[PDB]
C-alpha cells in the first residue's frame, strides 16, 4: 500500500490493526490542524469536548444500531458479585474464558463526535432564531480492522454542527462546503468534493481512482430534531446538519502529500499551520 | 457534595455518571496544565500518544485481571453472521434486547496510560545504559460510576515512564516527587505527598494493598477537595519493580529483567482541583498562577 512507509515516522504498533501509538511528529500535525480548524470557527459557536464514550441509550435512540450495527463498539464489564468476578478470573487462570461474565454497560464507544450534542441542545428548550451552532470533538470508534493507515478503528473526529430550521442548516452546509475547500487548498491538498444528503472532500492517497474521504458534509433532515424533541423558533421539529473533519485522515493526507520532513513543507502551508 | 457547585461552568451531562461533556472554560485549563507538564519534560524523553483503546491480550498479559477486574471496560460488538446481526437489530426494533448477541472484541478501553508502552519498549531489544524515558497520555476508562466530579469513568491520564535498572527508576521517582510538589506549589494548590495503595479487588486485594503500602511502591499527591480528612489523589508515583520487565522480557544494560516506574498526572482531577481552589473566573486567578499557565 502507498501509505505504508509513513508508519515508520508516524506510528508504533499496539498489537491491533487500526489501533496505533502516535509519535511526537504525527501528534504535532494533528494539533496544528485542530488549531487551524478552530481559527475558522464562526461567531456564536459553542465548543464542547466529548470523551471517547457516550450513553448507549442515546446512541440506540439515534438510530445507529440500525445503519451500522457491525461497526458499533459497546462497553461491557464484570458487573457481578465479588464471588462471580473472582470465579471469572479463576477460569482465565485455568485456561478458560473470563469474558462469559461480561454484561453490557450503559455506555458505547462513540462512532461519531456529534451524537451526544442533540440531547444536550434539546434539554435547553426551544431554539432561538437562527438556531444553535456547536463545535464538537471526540475520539471515535468504528469496528473496521484494516492494515491501511487511512482506515482506523480508533480515530479523532472534529465537527461543526447546525441545529435550526432547514434554511439555517442549508446556509450552514453551503458556507462550510466553500470554507472546507478553501482550508484544503491552504493546506496544499489535492481534492474533489463529491456526493457520497452527504458530500465528502476526497483526497487521493493510494489511488486517484479510489480517493479517501477526509471531511464530510451531512444533512440529517429532522431525524435528530424529532428523536430528541428539538423545537425550532417557529415551534417546528428542528433540522440538523454537520461538517466533520477526519483528524487522522487529514494528518495522514498532509504527510502523504508533503512528506515527513516539516522543514521541506511549502512556506504557505508552514505559515498557515504556524510552523 | 462540595464540588457540585462547579458543574455548571465546567461540564454538561451526557446521561451517564462520571461521563461529561467539557466546556471551553474547563478544556482551556486542561490544555494549559498539559502544556505546563510538557515544559517539565526531561531531555531524551520519547513522547507517545495512545488512543482510548488497547490490545485486550496485552492487558491480560499485564496482569490487570489479577488486580482490578471490576474496573475493566471491555470492547464488545456484534461479531456474528449477517443473519445473527439482522436478528439482533430486529429484536431491538421489537422492544427486545439486542445486547445478547454481543461478544468481546480483541480490545479493551485503556485503564492506565502507560500499559501499551512496555511491549513497545521490549520490541527494541536490550535497554541502553541509563534506560528509556517515555511521555505518554491516553483517555482512560475505569468502571467506577459516581456523581462526584473528581471520580470519573472516562478521564485523561498523562505520565512520565522510566524503564531501566532499579537505580534508574528509583532516581526518576525521587526526582519526580520533588518536581511534582514544586509544580503543585506553582499552581497555588494545597497538598501532601503520602504512602498509598492501589484499590486492589476483593479479599486478596486488602492483603495486596497493605503489602504495597508497607513496600512504599506507591505515593500520591493528595489535595483536599472536600476536607483534609478525605483528600483527592491528583498524581501518583508508582514503582513497579520488575513486573513489566519480566512480563515483556525487557532486558536492562546488565542483561537483567528491567525495573519500571511511572509518574501519573490525573488531568481531570488537577483541572477540578484548580477550579475548586481558584474559582471559575480566570481573570481573578493569582498572578503567579496565571503567569505559569501563560494566561
Ligand atoms: N458526524 C459525521 C460523521 O460521522 N461523518 S462520516 O464521514 O462518518 O465521518 C467523518 C469523517 O471521519 C473520518 N473517518 C471515518 N471513518 C474513519 C476510519 N475508519 N478511520 C479514520 N478516519 C475515519 C473521515 O475523514 C470521515 O470523513
Ligand atoms: N499508571 C499510573 C496509574 O494508573 N496510576 S493511578 O491509578 O494512581 O492513576 C493516576 C491518576 O489518575 C487519576 N485518576 C484515577 N482514577 C480516576 C477517576 N476515577 N477519575 C478521575 N481521575 C482519576 C488520579 O489523579 C490518579 O492519581
Ligand atoms: Zn456529525
Ligand atoms: Zn503508569
Curated annotation (Swiss-Prot), chain A:
It catalyses: an L-alpha-amino acid + holo-[ACP] + ATP = an L-alpha-aminoacyl-[ACP] + AMP + diphosphate. Keywords: ATP-binding, Ligase, Metal-binding, Nucleotide-binding, Zinc. Its EC number is 6.2.1.n2. It is an enzyme of class 6 (ligase). Belongs to the class-II aminoacyl-tRNA synthetase family. Amino acid--[acyl-carrier-protein] ligase subfamily. This is Amino acid--[acyl-carrier-protein] ligase 1. Lacks the N-terminal tRNA-binding domain compared to class-II aminoacyl-tRNA synthetases. Its cofactor is Zn(2+). The lineage of its organism: Bacteria, Pseudomonadati, Pseudomonadota, Alphaproteobacteria, Hyphomicrobiales. It comes from the Bacteria. InterPro entries: aa-tRNA-synt_IIb, aa-tRNA-synth_II/BPL/LPL. One of its GO terms (biological process) is tRNA aminoacylation for protein translation. It comes from Bradyrhizobium diazoefficiens (strain JCM 10833 / BCRC 13528 / IAM 13628 / NBRC 14792 / USDA 110). Gene3D superfamilies: Bira Bifunctional Protein, Domain 2. An L-alpha-amino acid binds at residue 159. Homodimer. Catalyzes the ATP-dependent activation of L-glycine and its transfer to the phosphopantetheine prosthetic group covalently attached to the vicinal carrier protein bsr0959 of yet unknown function. May participate in nonribosomal peptide synthesis or related processes. L-alanine is a poor substrate whereas L-serine or D-amino acids are not substrates for ATP-dependent activation. Does not display tRNA aminoacylation activity. Zn(2+) binds at residues 114, 159, 242. ATP binds at residues 142, 144, 151-152, 198, 213-216, 249. One of its GO terms (molecular function) is ATP binding. Binds 1 Zn(2+) ion per subunit.
UniProtKB/Swiss-Prot annotation, chain B:
It comes from the Bacteria. CDD domains: Gly_His_Pro_Ser_Thr_tRS_core. The keyword RNA-binding does not apply. ATP binds at residues 142, 144, 151-152, 218, 233-236, 269. Its cofactor is Zn(2+). The keyword ATP-binding applies. An L-alpha-amino acid binds at residue 159. Coiled coil: none annotated. It is an enzyme of class 6 (ligase). Its EC number is 6.2.1.n2. Keywords: ATP-binding, Ligase, Metal-binding, Nucleotide-binding, Zinc. GO terms for biological process: tRNA aminoacylation for protein translation. GO terms for molecular function: aminoacyl-tRNA ligase activity; ATP binding; metal ion binding. It catalyses: an L-alpha-amino acid + holo-[ACP] + ATP = an L-alpha-aminoacyl-[ACP] + AMP + diphosphate. Gene3D superfamilies: Bira Bifunctional Protein, Domain 2. Binds 1 Zn(2+) ion per subunit. Zn(2+) binds at residues 114, 159, 262. Pfam families: tRNA-synt_2b. Catalyzes the ATP-dependent activation of L-glycine and its transfer to the phosphopantetheine prosthetic group covalently attached to the vicinal carrier protein bsr0959 of yet unknown function. May participate in nonribosomal peptide synthesis or related processes. L-alanine is a poor substrate whereas L-serine or D-amino acids are not substrates for ATP-dependent activation. Does not display tRNA aminoacylation activity. Belongs to the class-II aminoacyl-tRNA synthetase family. Amino acid--[acyl-carrier-protein] ligase subfamily. Lacks the N-terminal tRNA-binding domain compared to class-II aminoacyl-tRNA synthetases. This is Amino acid--[acyl-carrier-protein] ligase 1. It comes from Bradyrhizobium diazoefficiens (strain JCM 10833 / BCRC 13528 / IAM 13628 / NBRC 14792 / USDA 110).
Amino acid at each position: 500500500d502507498p501509505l505504508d512507509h509513513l508508519a515508520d515516522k508516524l506510528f508504533h504498533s499496539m498489537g491491533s490493526d487500526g489501533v496505533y501509538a502516535r509519535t511526537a511528529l504525527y501528534e504535532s500535525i494533528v494539533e496544528r490542524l485542530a488549531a487551524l480548524i478552530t481559527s475558522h470557527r464562526e461567531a456564536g459557536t459553542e465548543a464542547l469536548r466529548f470523551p471517547p464514550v457516550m450513553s448507549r441509550a442515546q446512541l440506540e435512540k439515534s438510530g445507529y444500531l440500525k445503519s451500522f450495527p457491525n461497526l458499533l463498539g459497546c462497553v461491557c464489564g464484570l458487573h457481578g458479585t465479588e464471588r462471580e468476578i473472582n470465579a471469572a478470573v479463576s477460569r482465565f487462570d485455568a485456561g478458560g474464558d473470563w469474558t462469559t461474565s461480561l454484561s453490557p454497560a450503559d455506555l458505547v464507544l462513540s462512532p461519531a463526535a456529534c451524537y451526544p450534542v442533540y440531547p444536550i441542545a434539546a434539554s435547553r428548550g426551544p431554539l432561538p432564531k437562527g438556531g444553535l451552532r456547536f463545535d464538537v470533538a471526540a475520539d471515535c470508534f468504528r469496528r473496521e480492522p484494516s492494515k491501511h493507515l487511512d482506515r482506523l478503528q480508533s480515530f479523532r473526529m472534529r465537527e461543526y454542527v447546525c441545529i435550526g430550521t432547514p434554511d439555517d442548516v442549508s446556509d450552514f452546509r453551503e458556507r462550510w462546503m466553500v470554507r472546507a475547500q478553501a482550508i484544503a487548498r491552504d493546506l496544499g491538498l489535492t481534492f474533489r468534493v463529491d456526493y457520497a444528503l452527504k458530500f465528502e472532500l476526497l483526497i487521493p492517497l493510494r489511488s486517484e481512482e479510489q480517493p479517501t474521504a477526509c471531511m464530510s458534509f451531512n444533512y440529517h433532515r429532522e431525524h435528530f430534531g424529532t428523536t430528541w424533541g428539538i423545537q425550532d423558533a417557529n415551534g417546528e421539529p428542528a433540522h440538523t446538519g454537520c461538517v466533520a473533519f477526519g483528524m487522522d485522515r487529514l494528518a495522514v493526507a498532509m504527510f502523504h502529500t508533503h512528506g515527513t520532513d516539516l522543514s521541506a513543507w511549502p512556506a504557505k502551508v508552514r505559515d498557515i499551520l504556524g510552523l
